[PDB]
């Protein structure tokens, strides 16, 4: 016995079917559509969008060998991977947090380039979906990571001097790489909205894409929006979409946050924005933080590792050690 | 009214009762049937014993406290959750046909608990277990971890493994089916005694309930409500051990701690539990604190100290 | 703008019926907000939620290689705005971005009013000589205009800029092009900005906007206790700012003053940027003027230094300059 509120069916043809005396799901199939829709006064084409919506309502092991089947993606930080169990998981969404000028934007455009390793080299071998709201994605840095990356690749293919390296650093040009990277840009957040509401199909057509990065969440939903409350259930309605997306499509999703002064006594202490529930959201969460003149990359939420504090830098060629 | 339910029925009767209404059975019941032999023409030998036998096959009879008593001496049990310091706050592990939620901040502990209890059962029991995980906090790397740090043998870590199944639902709709496609297995399949499920893990309900919150919107607490009343059958009238993990939110007013989901939900389960990390000196780590806020056979208010790191 | 849409008349009629107007606040509402106003169910409501979306973005797809290689199609990832000195064109890679905030900080006499008037001359030199053939816009909120130094410098202008050929500057009408506003408050600032600027970068006259300061009115009215209505006030104008920068293609720079440091990067510095961290995420570009008069004064001359605090693409360093009867200019061969 199914009852009939467990079904996305149209308020007005369920206070209809409480009306006439319908409960359950179970009787209405044992019945011709013709003489429930004149008993109910329920015309044809809602009648049988009824019948249809009401037809059409994996074991460890298996999660453990597709796990170990699909890599993680490297951010040429050797702790960082520890730390993280070897990248970022495909699957999960990962938010990141900092001040300004601590180096979110070059971590966005290092995972965007890493994401096309071939898989002989450990990496994934896929596409990525870059979409900036605030408009720092610029050109001549991508071009310099791939170019270091480039670099790196063919330095260590002619150290090992094995063959199929060669054959595959042999497409992995800049060109290539270049080439393989959907650049999208929303300004206000209706923008944002709808290019999610648009990205699965897009990522139906382009299956081999295997990284989305939204380059900053905080600056669309932090100016001009009064009512907490309706950001709030938008947050949240985002949230429960992206993961699904993530899951549905076989996706590691990376978001940008800003951080905010927190106020106690006298003392102010810099906590992440958008509210406190923002925080379950999150799979993974990281902070990056200022000491001295040292960058420290701290895990501070994740179901799989242990807190941890991580040094690493910024140099022409991208995200490094150290 | 429908037809082929119940002998005696005739297909001139049913269109001849269509003199008071159609909606249910509560009209051939809840009706003065004395009037009814000469309203539309009827004998009153034949409507007595049908609407006898009507009530009879669509209703339920009381069943005496002894028999009860004598039923639950031999069907009910107790799992316990792998920790002590939790067996000992809420006597040695969780009753199957009670509903458990544990309620936390970002973090703290929930899915921990939770994935630390499916290890134990499914190993020190031989049982059956399901997972629905909602928020994608299910990583088969941790509950790895958790076999290795109980036992050695790969193969009997592979037969564990193998009694735990997971679902995913991101949203009300899909938790729903999947709930009701195992009530219905497991109504059919009582004839069987093997392959049954006695513990059933929801991963987070505020993630798939929120969204429909919030506004002057009815059809969200309404949903709210039928997978509460899902929940509680299921625990019920079947014998299962259900936990469920929410959000834990700040009062503006009074500044105390409250559960998410509001006073409807505040209803829904019988035990609860709350966990709380140790500000200070003792902070991080596993060193958190556990607390029963909730309980019908324990006093409420009582203060226990937990770690997640040491298993 | 609804019926547009290729929708069956019942979501139309019950859309109709639902008082909206376009896909925009269609967009705005929510799930449960549009199941309560309309009384329509699940799929339909994504199905209009996609129709809608699909039409506003469109169904273009871009990638970074056409971005690389069609340079005249996005002109904002390649095009920059000349400082008028090769030093600091250099320091700066080209110049000033034409999509974004860029901010210069500093002390007294640093020489922030200095750039802002090279850079309002430099402006509406021709494509080839680094200028953008477009007026500026001067805001100012502190004192008044420096007239007689706008003056000396485009009487001085055949002399400090010797790479244009001299018989080209001479068409250029410099005074004639440069628009002067004034304000005196806060809601002043954020009413020029919302219904002044737009008129005058829409017929073209202006491609350059400068802030004189944005700290002065700021740091006046606001105490230590009311920072929320604060940080509303400069979360609005920095998304008014930007999205006019981006409609329009046009520069915005903002001059702003400094504080006393009695985590943010600034640790071995004595002063730092006044608005706050706030402020600072609406941000693109951020430079440092600075002059060092406590010490190596003796020397007989000041020493100016300008830095590169932050930016997406320009590593931190810095490099040296002095102003003269005829501009700012950068000393050859300091650049860090
Ligand atoms: N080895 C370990 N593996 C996994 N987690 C660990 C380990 N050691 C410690 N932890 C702790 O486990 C916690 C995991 O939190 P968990 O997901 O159980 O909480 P939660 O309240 O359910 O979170 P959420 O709101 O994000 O769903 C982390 O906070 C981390 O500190
Ligand atoms: N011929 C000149 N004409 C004008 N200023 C000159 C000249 N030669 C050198 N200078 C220097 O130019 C500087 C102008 O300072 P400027 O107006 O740029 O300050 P500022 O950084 O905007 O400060 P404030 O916060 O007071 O506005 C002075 O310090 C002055 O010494
Ligand atoms: N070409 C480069 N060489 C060296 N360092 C650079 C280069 N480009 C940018 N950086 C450094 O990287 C940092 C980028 O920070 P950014 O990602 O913009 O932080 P956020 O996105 O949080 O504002 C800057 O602090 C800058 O110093
Ligand atoms: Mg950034
Ligand atoms: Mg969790
Ligand atoms: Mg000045």
């Given amino acids: 016995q199914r009852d009939l509120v467990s079904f996305p069916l149209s308020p007005a043809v369920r206070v209809k079917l409480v009306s006439a005396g319908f409960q359950t799901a179970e009787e209405l199939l044992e019945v011709k559509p013709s003489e429930l829709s004149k008993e109910v006064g329920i015309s044809k084409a809602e009648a049988l969008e009824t019948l249809q919506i009401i037809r059409r309502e994996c074991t460890a092991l298996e999660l453990l060998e597709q796990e170990h089947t699909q890599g993680f993606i490297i951010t040429f930080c050797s702790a960082l991977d520890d730390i993280l169990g070897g990248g970022v998981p495909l699957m999960k969404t990962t938010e990141i947090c900092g001040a300004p000028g601590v180096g979110k934007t070059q971590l966005c455009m290092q995972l ?11 990496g994934v071998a896929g596409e990525a979906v870059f979409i900036d709201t605030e408009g720092s994605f610029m050109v001549d840095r991508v071009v310099d990571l791939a170019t270091a990356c480039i670099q790196h690749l063919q330095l260590i293919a002619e150290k090992h001097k094995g063959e199929e390296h060669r054959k595959a650093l042999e497409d992995f040009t800049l060109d290539n790489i270049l080439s393989h990277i959907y650049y999208f ?75 905010t002064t927190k106020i106690d006594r006298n003392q102010a202490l810099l906590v992440p924005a958008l509210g406190e529930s923002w925080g379950h959201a999150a799979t993974i969460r990281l902070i990056f933080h200022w000491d001295r003149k040292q960058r420290l990359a701290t895990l501070y939420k994740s179901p799989s590792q242990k807190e941890c504090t991580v040094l690493f830098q910024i140099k022409p060629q991208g995200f490094r050690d150290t | 009214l429908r037809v082929g339910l119940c002998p005696g029925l005739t297909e001139e009767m049913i269109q001849l009762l269509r ?22 023409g009827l004998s009153y030998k034949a409507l007595v014993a049908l609407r006898r036998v009507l009530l009879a096959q669509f209703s339920a009879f009381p069943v005496n406290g002894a028999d009860l008593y004598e039923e639950l001496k031999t069907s009910t049990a107790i799992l316990s959750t792998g920790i002590g310091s939790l067996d000992k706050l809420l006597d040695a592990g969780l009753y199957t046909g009670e509903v458990t939620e544990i309620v936390g901040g970002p973090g703290s502990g929930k899915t921990q608990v939770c994935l630390c209890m499916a290890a134990n059962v499914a190993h020190g029991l031989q049982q059956n277990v399901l997972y629905v995980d909602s928020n994608g906090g ?37 938790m729903l089916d999947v709930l009701q496609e195992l009530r219905g297995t497991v109504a059919q399949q009582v004839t069987g005694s093997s392959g049954t499920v006695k513990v059933v893990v929801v991963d987070s309900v505020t993630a798939v309930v929120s969204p429909l919150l919030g506004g002057q919107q009815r059809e969200g607490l309404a949903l709210m409500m039928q997978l509460a009343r899902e929940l509680k059958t299921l625990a019920r009238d079947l014998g299962m051990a259900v936990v469920v993990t929410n959000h834990i939110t ?36 596993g060193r958190r604190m556990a607390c029963l806020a909730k309980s019908s056979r324990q006093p409420t208010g009582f203060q226990e100290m937990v770690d997640i790191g040491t298993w | 703008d609804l019926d547009l849409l290729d929708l069956n008349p ?38 209009l939620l996609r129709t809608a979306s699909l039409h506003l973005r469109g169904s273009s797809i871009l990638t970074a290689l056409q971005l690389h290689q069609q340079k005249e199609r996005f002109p904002t990832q390649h095009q920059r705005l000349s400082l008028g000195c090769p030093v600091l064109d250099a320091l700066l890679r080209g110049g000033l971005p034409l999509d974004g ?134 979360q609005s104008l920095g998304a008014t ?88 200019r950068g000393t050859p061969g300091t650049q860090s």
Avoid at chain 3, 261 to 283: K, Y
């Fill in chain 3, 101 to 234: 905030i860029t901010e210069l900080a500093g002390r007294s006499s640093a020489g922030k009013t200095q750039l802002a008037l090279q850079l309002c001359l430099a402006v509406q030199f021709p494509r080839q000589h680094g200028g953008l053939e477009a007026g500026a816009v001067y805001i100012c909120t502190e004192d008044a205009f420096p007239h007689k130094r706008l003056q000396q410098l485009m009487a001085q202008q055949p002399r400090l800029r010797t790479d244009v050929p001299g018989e080209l500057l001479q068409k250029l009408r410099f005074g004639s092009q440069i628009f002067i506003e004034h304000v005196a408050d806060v809601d002043t600032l954020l009413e020029c900005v919302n219904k002044k600027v737009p008129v005058l970068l829409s017929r073209g006259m202006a491609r350059l906007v400068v802030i004189d300061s944005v700290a002065a009115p700021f740091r006046c009215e606001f105490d230590s206790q009311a920072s929320a209505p604060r940080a509303r006030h400069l």
């Fill in chain 1, 185 to 259: 840009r929303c300004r206000d957040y209706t923008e944002l909205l709808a290019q999610v509401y648009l990205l699965p199909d897009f990522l139906s057509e382009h299956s081999k894409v295997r990284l989305v990065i939204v380059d900053g969440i905080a600056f669309p939903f932090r100016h001009d929006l009064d009512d907490l409350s309706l950001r709030t259930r938008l947050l949240n309605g985002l949230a429960q979409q992206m993961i699904s997306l993530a899951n549905n499509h076989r996706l590691a999703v990376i978001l940008t946050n800003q951080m």
């Fill in chain 2, 138 to 174: 299910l990583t088969a790397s941790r509950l790895l971890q958790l076999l290795q740090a109980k036992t050695q043998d790969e193969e009997e870590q592979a037969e564990a493994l193998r009694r735990i199944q997971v679902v995913h639902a991101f949203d009300i709709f899909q």
């Fill in chain 2, 19 to 40: 003199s008071h209404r159609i909606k249910t059975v509560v009209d051939l019941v809840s009706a003065d049937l004395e009037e009814v032999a000469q309203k539309c």
């Fill in chain 3, 241 to 328: 700012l930007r999205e006019l920068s981006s409609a329009f293609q046009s520069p915005v720079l903002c001059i702003n003053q400094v504080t006393e440091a009695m985590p943010l990067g600034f640790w071995d510095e004595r002063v730092s940027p006044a608005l706050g961290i706030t402020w600072a995420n609406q941000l693109l570009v951020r430079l440092l003027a600075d002059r060092l008069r406590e010490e190596e004064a003796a020397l007989g001359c000041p020493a100016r230094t300008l830095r590169v605090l932050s930016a997406p693409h320009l590593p931190p360093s810095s490099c040296s300059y002095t102003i003269s009867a005829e501009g700012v």
């Fill in chain 3, 10 to 47: 019942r979501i139309i009629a019950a859309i109709k019926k639902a008082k909206l107007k376009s896909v925009k606040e269609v967009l705005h509402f929510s799930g449960p907000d549009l199941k309560r106003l309309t009384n329509l169910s699940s799929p339909e409501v994504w199905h």
């Fill in chain 2, 250 to 285: 700040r009062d503006r007013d009074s500044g105390r701690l409250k559960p998410a989901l509001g006073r409807s939900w505040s209803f829904v389960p019988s035990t609860r539990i709350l966990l709380d990390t140790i500000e200070g000196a003792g902070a991080s780590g």
């Fill in chain 1, 112 to 122: 965007a380039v890493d994401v096309q390793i071939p898989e002989c080299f450990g």
